[PDB]
Design a protein around this ligand. Structure first.
Ligand code: CA
Length: 415
């Protein structure tokens, strides 16, 4: 210290490189949302497991051709038929019903006309097949969708609803996945009160802990609220040790300026014996951001000490923390999605790469979304930030960007 000013790219790479992938565990398939498979998943049955009708209509012998047929009965979804269709006969089928022995094609009800019923009109007796069925027509043969022994989901797959459904389809209800990181969050500073407290002289309410916890929670990960910790080395060590014991990841905010009353980086190094990989970043906001690892009992814990400024803390959490958590839970490429958007407003550039929350809006038939920086319309004011504007460092030629120009926006929210 002063720690060297680390370049943004180097800082980001270092976080991903130094972050570990967590161990695996078996879960029930219904709890798979957002999880990554640590195993291949195989089908042990065919889908369909029996030749299945695609349509409501009639199972026929294509060789009988068009004409008038006796209806020998009905194959219903859920029941294996026991009759065999002999030439000049058909059996009624519905969508999903098994095709009976002796039929080789299905004709949909629309290509037929009913001749005879039962006086009850309970039973169709005879039907006119108006078309020449193509062989195998409107039948899903055994294994058409999935074969027995087929690998349906590969290790590394990040699961959403359809993947949960596929597990359900093949009956693999328990799967091995990577664990989710448990994330512990503290705030430090003698000025901070809880959100629940009325103000006292010289104090303000801690908003970072809430905003950071909600951010991590939005991504699906379990959290621990370590509370407010004062500006003093002894209490910081205790809190940090508690965090280490209870979590995979610790996030702090405040206590990382160069000033006094700022001991956190010192505690990380000497007291905790952590390795600090960077202690400042050439970025705006986020200058004092610090990243450390701690290897204890063959397990690596990671520690992010973010700036106390509330805006810096959310921005740095999105840039550095979220990707790391994605790596820890097994996502193979944990990097954020970056899209192109048009600036809604002129901006003057900083020597530092700069980042700002924004709202992405796609207009009527315009191909690119507009990025509107938050903090300046009501209808828009009722929209939570869903992007982080990524402004390029000032260069001798480019000192500002104009409304309309195409910029990178990192996605941080829905849509
Ligand atoms: Ca402070």
């Amino acid at each position: 210290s002063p720690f060297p000013l680390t370049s943004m790219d180097k800082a980001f790479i270092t976080v991903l490189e130094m972050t570990p992938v967590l161990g695996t565990e078996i879960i029930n398939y219904r709890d798979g949302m957002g999880r990554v498979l640590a195993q291949d998943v195989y089908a042990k049955d065919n889908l369909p497991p029996f030749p299945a009708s695609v349509k409501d209509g009639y199972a026929v012998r294509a060789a009988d051709g068009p004409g008038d047929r006796f209806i020998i009965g009905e194959s219903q979804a859920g029941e294996q038929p026991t009759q065999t269709v002999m030439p000049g006969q058909v059996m009624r089928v519905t969508t999903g019903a098994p095709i009976p022995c002796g039929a080789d094609a299905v004709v949909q009800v629309e290509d037929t006309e009913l001749i005879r019923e039962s006086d009850d009109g309970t039973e169709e007796l005879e039907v006119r097949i108006l078309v020449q069925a193509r062989p195998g027509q409107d039948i899903r043969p055994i294994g058409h969708d999935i074969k027995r022994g087929e690998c349906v989901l590969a290790k590394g797959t990040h699961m959403g609803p359809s993947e949960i459904g596929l597990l359900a389809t093949v009956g693999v209800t328990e799967v091995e996945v990577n664990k989710f990181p448990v994330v512990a969050v503290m705030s430090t500073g003698n000025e901070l009160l809880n959100p629940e407290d009325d103000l006292l002289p010289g104090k303000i309410r801690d908003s970072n802990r809430s905003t950071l916890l909600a951010t991590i929670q939005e991504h699906g990960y379990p959290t621990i609220n370590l509370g407010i910790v004062g500006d003093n080395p002894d209490d910081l060590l205790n809190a940090l040790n508690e965090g280490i014991s209870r979590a995979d990841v610790i996030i702090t905010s405040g206590g990382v300026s160069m000033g006094e009353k700022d001991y956190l980086k010192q505690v990380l190094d000497i007291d905790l014996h952590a390795q600090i990989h960077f202690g400042r970043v050439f970025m705006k906001p986020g200058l004092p951001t610090t990243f450390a690892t701690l290897d204890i009992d063959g397990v690596r814990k990671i520690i992010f000490a973010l700036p106390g400024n509330p805006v810096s803390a959310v921005v740095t959490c999105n840039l550095f923390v979220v990707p790391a958590l994605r790596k820890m839970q097994g996502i193979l490429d944990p990097r954020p999605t970056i899209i192109k958007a048009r600036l809604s407003c002129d901006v003057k550039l900083d020597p530092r790469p700069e980042y700002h929350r924004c709202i992405l809006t796609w207009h009527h038939q315009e191909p690119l979304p507009w990025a509107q920086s938050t903090g300046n319309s009501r209808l828009m004011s009722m929209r939570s930030a869903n992007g982080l504007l990524m402004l390029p460092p000032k260069t001798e030629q480019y000192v500002e960007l104009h409304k309309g120009e195409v910029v990178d926006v990192m996605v941080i929210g829905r849509l």
